[PDB]
Amino acid sequence: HMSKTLQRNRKMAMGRKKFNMDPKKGIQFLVENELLQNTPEEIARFLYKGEGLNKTAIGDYLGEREELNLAVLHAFVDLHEFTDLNLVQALRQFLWSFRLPGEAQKIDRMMEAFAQRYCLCNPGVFQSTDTCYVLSFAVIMLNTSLHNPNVRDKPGLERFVAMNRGINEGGDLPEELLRNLYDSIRNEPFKIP
Numbered sequence: 001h002m003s004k005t006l007q008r009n010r011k012m013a014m015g016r017k018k019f020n021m022d023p024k025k026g027i028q029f030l031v032e033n034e035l036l037q038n039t040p041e042e043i044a045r046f047l048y049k050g051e052g053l054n055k056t057a058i059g060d061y062l063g064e065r066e067e068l069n070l071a072v073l074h075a076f077v078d079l080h081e082f083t084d085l086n087l088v089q090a091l092r093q094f095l096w097s098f099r100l101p102g103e104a105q106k107i108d109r110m111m112e113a114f115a116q117r118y119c120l121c122n123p124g125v126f127q128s129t130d131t132c133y134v135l136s137f138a139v140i141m142l143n144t145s146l147h148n149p150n151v152r153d154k155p156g157l158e159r160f161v162a163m164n165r166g167i168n169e170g171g172d173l174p175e176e177l178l179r180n181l182y183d184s185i186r187n188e189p190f191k192i193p
């Protein structure tokens with residue numbers, strides 16, 4: 001009925017604000033008030049939708065070390081569909097969905113989860129998930145190098161190719177793959193939330 005519905009709608013809006021102040025407190029409010037089911041999948045779907053949520057707060061919640069948060073991270077990554085996307089296309093979408101936290105161990109966990117998912121979704125591209133991880137950071141580094149004017153000397157394709165020798169189970173990645181990723185980043189910098 002109507003009274004319950006209107007009160008719930010306002011409470012949801014309050015929960016979102018609470019989340020943005022402190023993600024754990026926000027989710028606690030939504031759970032305790034039966035506005036959100038306390039499962040990894042439902043929490044992850046809530047964060048992926050991201051309505052009225054600050055992307056920095058989303059990344060903060062996703063980078064917590066405790067069991068439920070780890071499970072939400074895994075479920076959240078599983079919501080991304082990377083089939084038939086090149087690595088840059090996939091990274092654009094992932095990196096837009098939340099703002100990475102500052103802490104190296106958290107970022108490592110997030111990018112490893114990303115790497116695993118990309119590779120599962122595109123099994124023929126990289127035989128090793130280490131290769132996918134290293135090349136993911138290679139792309140992020142190229143984005144900065146090409147598009148940050150503080151980097152006063154811009155790496156050409158040949159340089160990008162040379163920097164990634166040996167990471168394909170001891171061999172090299174296909175030149176055309178690297179060319180496609182280089183061109184993609186050159187032509188469109190990553191958007192940060």
Ligand SMILES: COc1ccc(S(=O)(=O)Nc2c(C)cc(O)cc2C)cc1
Nearest residue numbers: 095098099100107140143190191192193
């Ligand atoms: C140490 O990890 C990183 C990861 C990505 C980047 S970046 O892609 O150059 N900027 C960025 C960062 C920091 C966070 C985001 O959620 C999205 C973007 C685009 C910079 C550093």
